[PDB]
């Protein structure tokens, strides 16, 4: 039993390494100044944003700079572009979770929809400290303060993610822990519209056992870590709910915003 659980943990960690280019290990190395690489460009204000701005990954008809006169909208679009690529990464990872691709294809789609926002905020915590967030594949750092200074509605956009990240990072998970945690989140059987719930629940049961074992071995002195982590899954759901509410506000007030069709598919009836 336990041998298979360990094998499952290792399978998931290897797949995680293949799917996600910027890991927590790499991010923490950068954030702690423990890398040989040139340290990130810091965007803490409007002037540093000009310089740094061309560092944001955005690929479109015109450069990011020309998208809006409003800085908050350009940052918004940057987050959106990253989000699309993050969904692609999570999809590849999900395909590596044993049993997932054998589920009803429509159930695979449903799991990814509801799941991808929760996973994005989990991993986002890997890129954060209490003062800001790594951007552009770790080549940039945007301060929490600067993000908070954006005009409403956009000023409160990132703050709940930072709050979650502070608590979540206090758990000191590493990438092997996270690989299983994320797999657990994807395989939630209570997602709306799931056709076959039981097979999904079966896989999640197995993943949850693997996670429990992983946390006991990797964090022997952290008591009830498993319990604390499960409660975080529920927290993430609340984060997403509030994010969607803000997005609806933005949609009503600002027509200068445009959603990528992939994100539109994800947000529809969600």
């Amino acid at each position: 039993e336990s041998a298979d659980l360990r094998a499952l943990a290792k399978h998931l960690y290897d797949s995680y390494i293949k799917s996600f280019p910027l890991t927590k290990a790499k991010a923490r190395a950068i954030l702690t100044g423990k890398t040989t690489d040139k340290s990130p460009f810091v965007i803490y204000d409007m002037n540093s944003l000009m310089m740094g701005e061309d560092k944001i990954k955005f690929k479109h008809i015109t450069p990011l700079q020309e998208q809006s006169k409003e800085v908050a909208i350009r940052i918004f679009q940057g987050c959106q572009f990253r989000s699309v690529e993050a969904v692609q990464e999570i999809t590849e990872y999900a395909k590596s979770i044993p049993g997932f691709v054998n589920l009803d294809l429509n159930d695979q789609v449903t799991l990814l929809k509801y799941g991808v926002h929760e996973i994005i905020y989990t991993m986002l915590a890997s890129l954060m400290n209490k003062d800001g967030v790594l951007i552009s594949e770790g080549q940039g750092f945007m301060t929490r303060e600067f993000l908070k200074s954006l005009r409403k509605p956009f000023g409160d956009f990132m703050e709940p993610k930072f709050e979650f990240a502070v608590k979540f990072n206090a758990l000191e998970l590493d990438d092997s822990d996270l690989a299983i945690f994320i797999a657990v989140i994807i395989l939630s059987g209570d997602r709306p519209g799931l056709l076959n719930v039981k097979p999904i629940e079966d896989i999640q049961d197995n993943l949850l056992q693997a996670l429990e074992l992983q946390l006991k071995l990797n964090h022997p002195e952290s008591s009830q870590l498993f319990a604390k982590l499960l409660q975080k899954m529920t927290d993430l759901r609340q984060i997403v709910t509030e994010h969607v509410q803000l997005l609806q506000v933005i949609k009503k007030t600002e027509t200068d915003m445009s959603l990528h069709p992939l994100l539109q598919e994800i947000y529809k009836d969600l």
Binding site: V87, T91, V109, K113, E265
Partner: peptide
């Protein structure tokens, strides 16, 4: 047409 489905069916 689902773009998620498109990504899932990618190689």
């Amino acid at each position: 047409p689902s773009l998620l489905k498109k990504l899932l069916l990618a190689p």
